[PDB]
Amino acid sequence: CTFYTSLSNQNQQNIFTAGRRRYMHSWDLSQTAKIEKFSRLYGHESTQRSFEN
Amino acid sequence: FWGATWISRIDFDVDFPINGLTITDESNFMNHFFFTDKYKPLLFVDLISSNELAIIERNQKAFIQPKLVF
């Protein structure tokens, strides 16, 4: 897991996390949490089996 | 006369009316009338008799590329 702050728009904050799974999560930054899932590699799915590293 | 896919007959007593995928050939190579394309391909052509003409013609799994049909 790791924080991420866009270099240009400092107001932007985000948290990326991954595991032994074929998808990645991103959390934008208090009733709810805005969570988006990256699960598309655009044709290179064979080369990538897990987003763990 | 006959080639791979054509047959022709020319009478030599009569004069004729005057009326991309190969080398352009700018360089040198070194240093009464009948025509039919109906019979092809032809392995060999000859006359058996004066009024008999003999034509000899030719009579694997492949990767499938379907053709769409609706």
Binding site: - | A4, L21, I23, T24, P41, F44, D46, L47, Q60, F63
Partner: protein, 129 residues
């Protein structure tokens, strides 16, 4: 079915194209290496082009186009260019030659040579008997 371009000095992959659906049995290039033509079991001939100036500066190849001309596998392919000639000749299990133009491969006409062209006759006929 992949065509991969490797940097020779460092021995690394620059680009990978998943173009064919089966084996790529032969490759050939034009004189200036502006075109790389591939062929194989899927009966297709893929043209990869790097003619554009921006492509040359960035050294990036492109899967420009493809064509289906053969009825079966393509085992042997060759390319020849001269001031008066431009040929991309291919052949395979279909037992026939196919000729194209390298410069105008995408849109240029093609010729399918006869399977048997009898310069030396293998059959004779005897008029008598």
């Amino acid at each position: 079915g992949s065509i991969k371009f490797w940097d020779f000095q460092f021995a690394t992959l620059n680009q990978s194209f998943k173009a064919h659906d089966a084996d790529v049995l032969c490759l050939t290039t034009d004189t200036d290496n502006n075109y790389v033509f591939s062929a194989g079991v899927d009966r297709k001939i893929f043209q990869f082009s790097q003619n554009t100036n921006k492509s040359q500066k960035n050294n990036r190849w492109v899967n420009s186009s493809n064509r289906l001309l053969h009825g079966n596998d393509i085992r042997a392919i060759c390319a020849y260019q001269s001031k008066g000639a431009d040929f991309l000749v291919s052949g395979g299990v279909e037992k026939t030659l196919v000729i194209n133009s390298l410069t105008s491969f995408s849109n240029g006409n093609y010729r399918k040579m006869p399977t048997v062209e009898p310069y030396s006759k293998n059959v004779l006929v005897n008029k008598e008997q």
